[model samples]
Target: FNKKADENKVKGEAFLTENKNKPGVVVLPSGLQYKVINSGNGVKPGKSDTVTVEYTGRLIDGTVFDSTEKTGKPATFQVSQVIPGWTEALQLMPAGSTWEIYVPSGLAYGPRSVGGPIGPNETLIFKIHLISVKKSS
Candidate 1:
């Protein structure tokens, strides 16, 4: 696990280093990278807010991990139910916003190779569509 974790860490870091300089990519102090694909109106959501979104996630090497496009349905869930990167980026966006989000392993699933779409310490790239927002009770 450590070997895979180390390998992923190195690759993820290198990928981020190069991606950081790309145009449209905005690096936040938290190390999350984002590029706004479409703008939205004033309706920023809170952490407790319920939101609906469509998304496609990929690995650094362009491997398609997961996608709502494949599911053919948008996901509606509370803000905190997702990964750390999503939790942070979604709150900064509003309804109708679309963004390309980059999530490092630390902000995502870290060591221990979670048997999921993402690997141990692997970086994640997500094309996210913020379809709507509904404030939580």
Candidate 2:
């Protein structure tokens, strides 16, 4: 497990470095990367809020591991209750916005494999369409 973690850590780091040089990408201090696809105005989610979104997640080699794009409805969840990468991205996006987000393994599943397509320490990329924000009641 340690060896796999270390291997992925190195691969993830290099992937991020190369991705940063791509047009429209911005690097955050927490090592998250994002590129705006749509500029939305108005209300944004905070830590305690719930948000509705349509998204697709993919691995580095372009394998799509998850998505809600064809559900005919969106997914709604508490802003602070998801993976760290998603939490950070959701908090920064306003309603009706869309962004392509890059997540380092450190902010994702880390050393633990989630018993699915996502492996230990593998970095992920997600395309998110923010539909709305529901304030905590």
Candidate 3:
């Protein structure tokens, strides 16, 4: 279990280093990376806010795990109820923004595998479209 996790950690770090100088990529202090595809001027979500979004989640190798497009429907969920990387990114994205987010394994599933295409300590990528924000009561 830890063997795979360790290997993936090394690979994930190298991947991030390669992307550090890529155009448009913003490397946050938390080690999460993102590049804006489209910027939005509307409301930004708070940690407790619910948001509607369209997103495709994939591995560093480009294997897709989940996608809203597959079901032809956007998803609605709480901002703070997601992975650490997602939670952080969603807070920065305004409604109607589209961004490509690069999540390091530390901010992802980490040592635990999700029992599918996602493996232990694997890096993840997400193409996210922030459709709207709904404030929590």
User: Best by lDDT, which number?
Assistant: 1
lDDT (Cα, tens digit) per residue for candidate 1, span 7-110: 87788778887887767887655567877778776475577777777777787656887777788987777767877766777767677778888787776665
User: Candidate 1 or 2, higher TM-score?
Assistant: 1
Local accuracy by lDDT, each model: 0.72, 0.70, 0.71
Model 3, span 16-109: residue lDDT tens: 7787766788865555787778887567647777778777777665577778879898777876888776777777777777888877766666
Model 1 global lDDT (CA atoms, 0 to 1): 0.72
* Candidates 2 and 3, the one with greater TM-score: 3
- Evaluated against the true structure, the overall lDDT of model 3 is 0.71
Q: Report how far residue 46 has shifted in candidate 1, in Å.
A: 1.0
Give the per-residue Cα lDDT of candidate 1 at 75. 70
- Ranking the candidates on lDDT from highest down gives 1, 3, 2
Each candidate: RMSD: 3.0, 3.5, 3.3
Better of 1 and 3 by TM-score: 1
